[PDB]
Amino acid sequence: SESETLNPSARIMTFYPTMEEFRNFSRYIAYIESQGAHRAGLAKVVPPKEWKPRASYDDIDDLVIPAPIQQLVTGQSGLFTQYNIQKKAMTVREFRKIANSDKYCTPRYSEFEELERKYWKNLTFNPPIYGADVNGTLYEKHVDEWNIGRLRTILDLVEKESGITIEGVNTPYLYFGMWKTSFAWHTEDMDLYSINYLHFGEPKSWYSVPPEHGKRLERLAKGFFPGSAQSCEAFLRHKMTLISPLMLKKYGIPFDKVTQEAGEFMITFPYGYHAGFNHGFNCAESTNFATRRWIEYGKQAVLCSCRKDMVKISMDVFVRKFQPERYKLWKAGKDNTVIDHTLPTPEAAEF
Numbered sequence: 001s002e003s004e005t006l007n008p009s010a011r012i013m014t015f016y017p018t019m020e021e022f023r024n025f026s027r028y029i030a031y032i033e034s035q036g037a038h039r040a041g042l043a044k045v046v047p048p049k050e051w052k053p054r055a056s057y058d059d060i061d062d063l064v065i066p067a068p069i070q071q072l073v074t075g076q077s078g079l080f081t082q083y084n085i086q087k088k089a090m091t092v093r094e095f096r097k098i099a100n101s102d103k104y105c106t107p108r109y110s111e112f113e114e115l116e117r118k119y120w121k122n123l124t125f126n127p128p129i130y131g132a133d134v135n136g137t138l139y140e141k142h143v144d145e146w147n148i149g150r151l152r153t154i155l156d157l158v159e160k161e162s163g164i165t166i167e168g169v170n171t172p173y174l175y176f177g178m179w180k181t182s183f184a185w186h187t188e189d190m191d192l193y194s195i196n197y198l199h200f201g202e203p204k205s206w207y208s209v210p211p212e213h214g215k216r217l218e219r220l221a222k223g224f225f226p227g228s229a230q231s232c233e234a235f236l237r238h239k240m241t242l243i244s245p246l247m248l249k250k251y252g253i254p255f256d257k258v259t260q261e262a263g264e265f266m267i268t269f270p271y272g273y274h275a276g277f278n279h280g281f282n283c284a285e286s287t288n289f290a291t292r293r294w295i296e297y298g299k300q301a302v303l304c305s306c307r308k309d310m311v312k313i314s315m316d317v318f319v320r321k322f323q324p325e326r327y328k329l330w331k332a333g334k335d336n337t338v339i340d341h342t343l344p345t346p347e348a349a350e351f
């Protein structure tokens with residue numbers, strides 16, 4: 001009730017940290033959770049105006065996009081399935097050229113609602129190319145604040161313990177977008193946190209569903225896609241499923257929306273379903289991370305059961321280290337802990 005009194009509407013919150021607050025990443029995450037930001041599943045953090053992760057983005061024209069994907073979308077009435085078609089490798093220069101070309105460039109519009117309507121109206125036409133899942137970073141090696149390449153959260157325990165790297169999850173990914181490129185409805189692998197930084201370019205728009213309401217979205221999605229639901233216990237993790245905000249409203253699924261500008265951070269929280277699209281040519285960097293609060297989510301995450309090489313992180317080291325008194329019960333399959341999506345991560349006891 002202390003936590004349930006904070007952000008009771010579960011709306012997307014925006015934060016403007018000072019440079020002092022901005023330096024300690026995990027601490028500021030704990031803070032915004034103390035303010036109830038996590039209840040939305042998504043939050044925006046606008047960094048100090050003097051902070052910059054890179055002096056200049058003029059040298060990256062020759063950066064290679066090894067596996068650009070053409071996004072074919074099929075559907076109607078607010079329900080869509082996205083099929084990825086991998087294209088030949090190409091450079092950022094070659095990508096931007098195509099992105100800004102007359103055929104793929106952003107349509108003209110007044111307010112955001114107009115561009116949003118055009119997105120949902122034309123989603124299945126003129127399939128765009130997304131320069132997605134590029135291994136790398138655009139942070140300068142010296143930037144110590146909010147460095148996606150080295151956030152130093154307890155997610156580091158995975159590699160530290162096993163040597164295992166999972167691309168885009170405990171390593172950084174770059175996303176080069178063009179108009180009408182999409183990311184489908186999903187939570188993160190193992191229901192982790194994620195961080196997303198829009199380095200440059202046109203905006204990225206987001207939809208989010210509160211974790212305390214995530215199950216309702218799942219039930220809706222299973223109803224809409226019964227074939228997919230029968231074939232996999234977590235088919236949304238395929239990240240192929242697009243659902244319009246009008247469809248969510250029609251079925252009483254609560255949600256919020258936010259538009260991300262260049263130079264801005266987006267944080268997604270455990271079991272926070274989100275989706276969205278890019279307004280035009282841009283570039284974003286992202287990875288996943290953890291807090292102590294995530295551990296229970298990780299233990300209870302419902303994973304994909306049909307796809308091989310799907311991301312499954314062993315929770316053992318986390319339970320042993322941060323829940324020693326529950327380790328035996330958990331191994332015996334008798335840990336029946338129930339998650340309260342309103343509670344902030346325990347690191348926020350300072351606040």
Ligand SMILES: Nc1ccc(O)c(-c2cc(C(=O)O)ccn2)c1
Nearest residue numbers: 175182183188189194196239284
């Ligand atoms: N395929 C995938 C996996 C995990 C993710 O977290 C995302 C994702 C991508 C974007 C993006 O395309 O910028 C935004 C939010 N989530 C995509």
Ligand SMILES: [Cl-]
Nearest residue numbers: 234235236237
């Ligand atoms: Cl699912």
Ligand SMILES: [Cl-]
Nearest residue numbers: 168173286287
């Ligand atoms: Cl990612």
Ligand SMILES: [Mn+2]
Nearest residue numbers: 187188194268
């Ligand atoms: Mn995501």
Ligand SMILES: [Mn+2]
Nearest residue numbers: 225226227228
């Ligand atoms: Mn189906």
Ligand SMILES: [Zn+2]
Nearest residue numbers: 232304305306
């Ligand atoms: Zn599956």
